[PDB]
RNA sequence: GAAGCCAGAGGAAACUCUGGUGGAGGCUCGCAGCGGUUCUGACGUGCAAAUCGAUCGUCAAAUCUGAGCAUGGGGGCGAAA
RNA sequence: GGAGACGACGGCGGGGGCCCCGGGCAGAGUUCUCUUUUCUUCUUAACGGUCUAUCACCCUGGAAACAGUUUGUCUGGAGAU
RNA sequence: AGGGAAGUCGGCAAAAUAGAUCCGUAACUUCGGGAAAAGGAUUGGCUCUAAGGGUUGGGCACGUGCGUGCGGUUAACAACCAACUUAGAACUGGUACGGACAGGGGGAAUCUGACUGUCUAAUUAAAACAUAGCAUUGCGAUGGCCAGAAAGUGGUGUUGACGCAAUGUGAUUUCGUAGCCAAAUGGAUUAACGAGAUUCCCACUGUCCCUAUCUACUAUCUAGCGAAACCACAGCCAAGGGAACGGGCUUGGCAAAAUCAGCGGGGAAAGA
RNA sequence: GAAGCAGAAUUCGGUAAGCGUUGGAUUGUUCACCCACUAAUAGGGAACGUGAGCUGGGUUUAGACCGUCGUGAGACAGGUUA
């Protein structure tokens, strides 16, 4: 279930894009500094529980081993084996490359 | 005094007022969705049962 | 998920704890039925001299209901308006 | 003296009917492809005979190392198994 | 779209929640509850795995399928038959997985009635009534409460104080930075329950900024059918018309057949 | 137009109604005072010298409770609810 579905796709329901989690998963500057833009006092849990792969904070660590069993955690690890989509696949999708001399 | 805010409601370690209320919301699961502590209406029932004699607080008189 | 019952762990016993079983209650959600809370509702020479829709209360009983019979105006009946 | 002759509710067990599954005969439909396929009929009254069906009762016998036993803890030296 | 109660007396209405499995759940409490509290995780398809059952059947010695006297609890084994649940694992599509339907928004408090229940058929469902509980009064039969015109009349009465009748009230509880006294508590600051009244928070949204678009039925036009309310006569205004009132009079402005869809200023129109 | 009116910002006054004159909080209340934005947040009439567009309060049929008065039916200094 998804909750209020009707107004899923505004962007005040926006969640955190794919290829952001690649990077975070790659560099971890670039999730700190995706910490530092909440506010770790409201965070469930504190903010000490959270799952990169599917960029969601629990209340507590059997909640966390309790979600990565589940099929939304399977899919998105299954969604970061594909890779995610980015700038340099759309350039090579149409065969367009950078020319930096 | 801090021991009758104690006994009053069996909470212990803060260190100044927001500690408090989200100690107290989380202990009374006053939570507001994804487990955010209700900090406001903690406050709120705080501020109650202060006006409403639940928490023991007077004022000395002064000596002579 | 109440008494009652079974097994185990203690406790000198009386009792305590754990896992079951059982199926009580003018208990509860809720279909029918009974009722009638709300809507700038519909209708307003209406389908209707009180109807329609959504929503709502109750739903094992102080529940709902038929036929036969009893109470008749200075009256009767009335969980009393 | 028995019958006529008697409340409400709960779970358990037996039987009839309905529902469901399989085989077979016949008929019908589908059939680009698949489908030994899908559907339809295959029934047995009152009244009787005969053989059996929980409870209960009778005979032998005398039960602790208590036993039989229901989903539900009742039964037995007032005689259980 | 973006914002999210800025709307409005007032979140009225609408939106959001909703089934099931698992984690977890506070104050208060009459210890029964509150509680589906709160707050979180998950749910499709496919291929498998595991667990949960029923029926039948034991070796000798004799007499001859049973009777014995024995001997044994590895039947812990074989054969046959059968259905619905539960748990676990991989793979796989995805913007959705209780995919339609169905289906609690939740919380912090205050007032109020103990609760379940009942009434104003056709404007009021409620703090009204009733209820159990509590207290008072009368009556021991040639009696109390009643009824009838009367009666050799009737009820309570197939009755006898743990009863009958009339009242009032209406569960239970009450009635020194922390001391003393009382049989753990010092309470009514009373739990649960509620289509009762009130304030607020989160969520939510067309309530609003600020409106736009789509569908059905009308309205519209046609064929057929076909009322009623109402009606002194009638219907453009301005200034004056003493009695604070003009539609008709005076003085002006003006003023062109016949029509259709709408509108709610005026006249009409409220079982007014 | 005038003012110690240097400038900037204004103050007093005149002609002027062409054109504007907002968004909100507050009902334990004569809802009137606050807040900000703004060029500015001016005031009135056509109702209130009785009076059918819609909807909240004065406001008050029938139900109900509390306070005051009355022996009582009831009335009200009043307050609440539908």
Not at chain 1, 10 to 36: A, F, G, V
Not at chain 1, 70 to 75: A, E, L, Q, S
Request: glycine share 8%; hydrophobic share 30%; charged share 35%.
């Amino acid at each position: 279930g998804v909750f209020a579905k009707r107004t899923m796709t505004k962007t005040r329901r926006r969640l955190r894009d794919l290829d952001q989690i690649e990077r975070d998963l790659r560099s971890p500057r670039h999730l700190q500094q995706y910490k530092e833009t909440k506010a770790a006092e409201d965070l469930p849990g504190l903010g000490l529980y959270y799952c990169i792969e599917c960029a969601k904070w629990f209340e507590s660590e059997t909640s966390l081993v309790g979600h990565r069993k589940g099929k939304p955690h399977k899919r998105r690890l299954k969604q970061l084996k594909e890779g995610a989509y980015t700038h340099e696949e759309a350039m090579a999708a149409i065969g367009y490359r950078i020319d930096n001399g | 005094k801090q021991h009758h805010m104690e006994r009053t409601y069996e909470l212990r370690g803060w260190k100044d007022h927001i500690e408090f209320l989200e100690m107290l919301a989380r202990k009374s699961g006053r939570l507001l969705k994804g487990g955010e502590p209700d900090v406001d209406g903690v406050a709120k029932q705080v501020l109650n049962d202060f006006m409403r004699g639940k928490i023991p607080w007077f004022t000395p008189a002064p000596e002579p």
